[PDB]
Write an enzyme that holds these catalytic residues in place. Structure first.
Site, mmCIF file in Angstrom:
data_model
loop_
_atom_site.group_PDB
_atom_site.id
_atom_site.type_symbol
_atom_site.label_atom_id
_atom_site.label_comp_id
_atom_site.label_asym_id
_atom_site.label_seq_id
_atom_site.Cartn_x
_atom_site.Cartn_y
_atom_site.Cartn_z
ATOM 1 N N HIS A 1 -3.564 -3.369 -24.400
ATOM 2 C CA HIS A 1 -2.923 -2.088 -24.656
ATOM 3 C C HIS A 1 -3.979 -1.002 -24.836
ATOM 4 O O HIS A 1 -5.143 -1.277 -25.138
ATOM 5 C CB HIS A 1 -2.018 -2.156 -25.890
ATOM 6 C CG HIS A 1 -0.647 -2.688 -25.606
ATOM 7 N ND1 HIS A 1 0.200 -3.132 -26.599
ATOM 8 C CD2 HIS A 1 0.027 -2.842 -24.442
ATOM 9 C CE1 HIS A 1 1.334 -3.539 -26.059
ATOM 10 N NE2 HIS A 1 1.255 -3.374 -24.751
ATOM 11 N N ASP B 1 -4.572 1.203 -27.052
ATOM 12 C CA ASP B 1 -5.192 1.378 -28.357
ATOM 13 C C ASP B 1 -6.122 0.228 -28.730
ATOM 14 O O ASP B 1 -6.602 0.187 -29.867
ATOM 15 C CB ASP B 1 -4.119 1.561 -29.436
ATOM 16 C CG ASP B 1 -3.193 0.367 -29.551
ATOM 17 O OD1 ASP B 1 -2.709 -0.117 -28.506
ATOM 18 O OD2 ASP B 1 -2.955 -0.090 -30.691
HETATM 19 C C1 MX0 Z 1 0.863 0.513 -27.630
HETATM 20 O O1 MX0 Z 1 0.296 0.710 -28.929
HETATM 21 C C2 MX0 Z 1 1.102 0.328 -30.008
HETATM 22 N N1 MX0 Z 1 2.313 1.115 -29.985
HETATM 23 C C3 MX0 Z 1 2.299 2.450 -30.110
HETATM 24 O O2 MX0 Z 1 1.259 3.067 -30.297
HETATM 25 C C4 MX0 Z 1 3.657 3.156 -30.000
HETATM 26 C C5 MX0 Z 1 4.307 2.833 -28.661
HETATM 27 C C6 MX0 Z 1 4.607 2.756 -31.142
HETATM 28 O O3 MX0 Z 1 5.672 2.184 -30.841
HETATM 29 O O4 MX0 Z 1 4.260 3.025 -32.306
HETATM 30 C C7 MX0 Z 1 1.248 -1.192 -30.137
HETATM 31 O O5 MX0 Z 1 1.749 -2.065 -29.473
HETATM 32 N N2 MX0 Z 1 0.645 -1.193 -31.368
HETATM 33 C C8 MX0 Z 1 0.744 -1.967 -32.511
HETATM 34 C C9 MX0 Z 1 0.299 -3.424 -32.578
HETATM 35 O O6 MX0 Z 1 0.655 -4.071 -33.546
HETATM 36 O O7 MX0 Z 1 -0.367 -3.836 -31.646
HETATM 37 C C10 MX0 Z 1 1.277 -1.263 -33.530
HETATM 38 C C11 MX0 Z 1 1.388 -1.741 -34.954
HETATM 39 C C12 MX0 Z 1 1.791 0.120 -33.204
HETATM 40 O O8 MX0 Z 1 0.800 0.872 -32.487
HETATM 41 C C13 MX0 Z 1 0.272 0.233 -31.335
HETATM 42 ZN ZN ZN Z 2 -0.427 -3.111 -28.727
HETATM 43 ZN ZN ZN Z 3 -1.776 -1.995 -31.406
#
Ligand code: MX0
Ligand code: ZN
Ligand code: ZN
Ligand code: MX0
Ligand code: MX0
Ligand code: MX0
Ligand code: ZN
Ligand code: ZN
Ligand code: ZN
Ligand code: ZN
Ligand code: ZN
Ligand code: ZN
Lengths: 264, 264, 264, 264
Positions: B84, B86
């Site tokens: 992903h 992030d």
């Molecule tokens: C794609 O990145 C994430 N999702 C988002 O940023 C948006 C789409 C959201 O729904 O908040 C995603 O999966 N993560 C996780 C994880 O646990 O991996 C958490 C806790 C939330 O943040 C990132």
């Molecule tokens: Zn993720």
């Molecule tokens: Zn994440």
């Protein structure tokens, strides 16, 4: 002080103003927006799409293809001018929902493969979903679909894989030679001594001569204003359109003035 | 009414708050931000990077590697938890500027190959520059760099290619077994009868048991708050950290409650 | 009557006759076979490999790199002339066992990506394990490793991505300009009106002029006999070697005679 | 002593003995050879091809599709059991000449992307032209073409991406549940402690239970002899065919005996 946030690729509203299919020739239709060209060519064995516009235009293209009586599985081929997000945006989604193939040259294929990232001039600022090219084409190669022959003409400049497509259609039975030439602009490009594109000036100059010599009775460009097309006025859209000579000669004057101002 | 504009992927400011290298073990360092984990492991034959965070963190990672005396050409391998934006954001740029290789499983490789586009739950909303995996790894495979062995453990759930990495470091000569487990969350996921992921519930459950049985004396997660890590307080960061059992058992309770609320 | 069996790509025995590292300049070494060139350039920050030969030469290249005191992790970059099996054969295996990156142009990258399959002239008859290019280079671009600058010069002809590499080494402190030019042959190619390569003659002619103008005090070619190199006689290998003019002028005479005989 | 020559992938002559379309159900046809299964499913909106056999069978498949009144542009989808050269051989050429898409899981896609090279057990000995997967599918996902639903069932073992496909056809209006299960053999595989496949035994065992529980009134396998199909005797081909239980139970007995003999 935190790191800066990501910034999206925002464009003019007219680039995203949907329009109904405007007819160009007996088999050629503009099905994009008011300021972004997306050409459909309906043949007896399937349809061909040239460019697609912004990434969020995939649904609009499918709706206009439905208006022309073209089912998703009837789109056989996707052709491109250059693999930037404002022209090749929906290519990935279109391949998933239409069962079509994409034909492009090596330079456009590799740029499309990484979704416009690591651009020679734009870096990672203009990024779209990536797609893969199914058939690699060479300069002067002929692609035939349903009896209509599409000839590619490499015109490197805006991108290393910029391609002009020429085909011969009819208009009430009279043969018209349509040329879809790519843009010849360099918005903010470093022209002189660019380490990522050392022979950029040689490619631009050689492409100006290429556009002049295109077999063309009617010229269209990815941005309609570049050839004085006005998709909004419907019937009178091709009224003040430019020739191949006029389009290449006007683009070269802008390139030289920009090149002269760059040396300052 | 024009089509809507593209929207960028904006995150919390703490996800982008750079921090100096905080030490985890004799060879393991956190070099990311306050709320995004990026682990560096310095060995005698090169460095290993686990995850990278947001796409705009590539420069910050390189600066912190320089602080640890690690040159760009000394980064040998890039390992991932899931692909992903992030967590695998800067992977493409890091490969260009460090000469490092990326090892990931088939599911993470194909998601990384299309830059997070066509996500099973997020569509094309969270997109980052694409990168290619150089080495494909299987479940339980061992990757060795400079005498330090990294064992992969597939834990499908958050993404089909979610992977936990376990290795044994030292802390003043005493062996510590570090487990870097991926997230077990499902933010907004359709759990029951998802056409893009039919056996999603079976994978989540089986992954909960996988995380419980990880050889682990110290647990870290892509988001530090998921295991009660607080990178901000420096020395006392691992004070209230969770165990593998506590992390998996808390994640499963949230999954079941969300699954029960989904049936409503 | 069953369908015919697959046939392997068999070559002359001298193409597979291993040889010890023969020195070309202070930093340039030939580490391939008697009839296949594989150039190693040892710098202060790592080694560079130009071509690799046949697919079954990966182990021989590694043994010769070990003789030069170059560990597998010290190979930083792999450069290519063209992506045929007898030159880019071991590239995939070398990337796995050395942690090196491959830099090539778009045309060579896409041919390397499909392992030489769907060749414009050879079809699927000469196929090798595929590999991916990590960095795409343009015509005239400079690649620097350890203070040694490698300049690429596109010379389309043998393959659309045929590239000549020029760099400046030393020989007992005296600067020597080494040019590694690709082959200019067309063994069995249809030159006139080839649908898969319409502008093939224009590319060959333009490449002849390119090879003539290369900054070159010493010329090497993928096949040593093409420039009258004899790797077998050791010290006197470069005795009867050809110039850039002599090599391009001899290749063009063969191209024109073959072109004239093709019109028969 | 020169390096050894490349050796081609030679098979039994019956694997390359072409046969005419033998009918399996109202919509299912075997169009491969006597000892290699290639299944065609004609629907109202297009045809579907399951496996293709050896690389040199592309022309034979097209001839048999023409006999069924299926034009090249009517082939919509290509499905695979596993991406070995004797089953996925012509996939690359078929995509070029039919305008069809390929759907496979992540493990089969990455193996198909490198053309069978770097095989976990075979290395680079069995290599075929590479192809790209257009749609990635998950375990239990449903692929629908022309009203016929194809359900995938992951059965890792022979390859990590081995997939069984089940669909419901008719036979004179009576619904028949056809299951196309992949091979469960391990010819020369190291089963115990294989570094490239650590959990290989767990995957084989779990796949035996998967094949037993397949909804199946008629079983077919990539090699017809594995389920006692005899494509040569025409009408009486499915006479002595095996059930799903009989096929999985016989394969597991061979796996355990081979596993016991491996410990010697
Ligand atoms: C794609 O990145 C994430 N999702 C988002 O940023 C948006 C789409 C959201 O729904 O908040 C995603 O999966 N993560 C996780 C994880 O646990 O991996 C958490 C806790 C939330 O943040 C990132
Ligand atoms: Zn993720
Ligand atoms: Zn994440
Ligand atoms: C990447 O898309 C373009 N650039 C931008 O949108 C930004 C980056 C900008 O500099 O204005 C790009 O190239 N286009 C062209 C073209 O002629 O092709 C024109 C006229 C300007 O718009 C698009
Ligand atoms: C694909 O490899 C080549 N061709 C063959 O091996 C067969 C197909 C053949 O036609 O002899 C190819 O090109 N080479 C060159 C070159 O000049 O590059 C020469 C001189 C001939 O050998 C190799
Ligand atoms: C790669 O192709 C196979 N292996 C070989 O051809 C050589 C390598 C061999 O070991 O005999 C492979 O797997 N097959 C299967 C199968 O069950 O899938 C069987 C029964 C044996 O033939 C093919
Ligand atoms: Zn553009
Ligand atoms: Zn544009
Ligand atoms: Zn060659
Ligand atoms: Zn050659
Ligand atoms: Zn097989
Ligand atoms: Zn087989």
């Amino acid at each position: 002080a935190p790191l800066p946030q990501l910034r999206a690729y925002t464009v003019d509203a007219s680039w995203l103003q949907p329009m109904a299919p405007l007819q160009v020739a007996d088999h050629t239709w503009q099905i994009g927006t008011e300021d972004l060209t997306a050409l459909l060519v309906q043949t007896a064995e399937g349809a061909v799409l040239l460019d697609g516009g912004m990434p969020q235009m995939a649904g609009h293209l499918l709706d206009n293809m439905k208006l022309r009586g073209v089912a998703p599985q009837d789109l056989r081929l996707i052709l491109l001018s250059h693999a930037h997000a404002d022209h090749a945006g929906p290519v990935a989604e279109l391949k998933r929902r239409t069962g079509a193939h994409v034909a492009a040259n090596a330079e456009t294929a590799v740029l499309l493969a990484r979704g416009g990232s690591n651009d020679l001039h734009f870096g990672d600022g203009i990024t779209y979903p990536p797609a893969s090219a199914d058939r690699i084409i060479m300069d002067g190669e002929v692609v035939t679909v349903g009896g209509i022959a599409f000839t590619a003409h490499f015109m490197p400049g805006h991108t290393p894989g910029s391609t002009a497509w020429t085909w011969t259609d009819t208009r009430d039975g009279k043969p018209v030679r349509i040329a879809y030439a790519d843009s010849l602009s360099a918005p903010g490009y470093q022209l002189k001594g660019n380490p990522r594109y050392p022979r950029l000036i040689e490619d631009y100059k050689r492409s100006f001569a290429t556009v002049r010599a295109l077999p063309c009775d009617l010229l269209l460009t990815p941005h309609p204003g570049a050839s004085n097309w006005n998709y909004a006025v419907g019937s009178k859209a091709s009224a003040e359109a430019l020739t191949c000579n006029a389009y290449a000669d006007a683009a070269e004057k802008k390139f030289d003035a920009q090149l002269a101002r760059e040396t300052a």
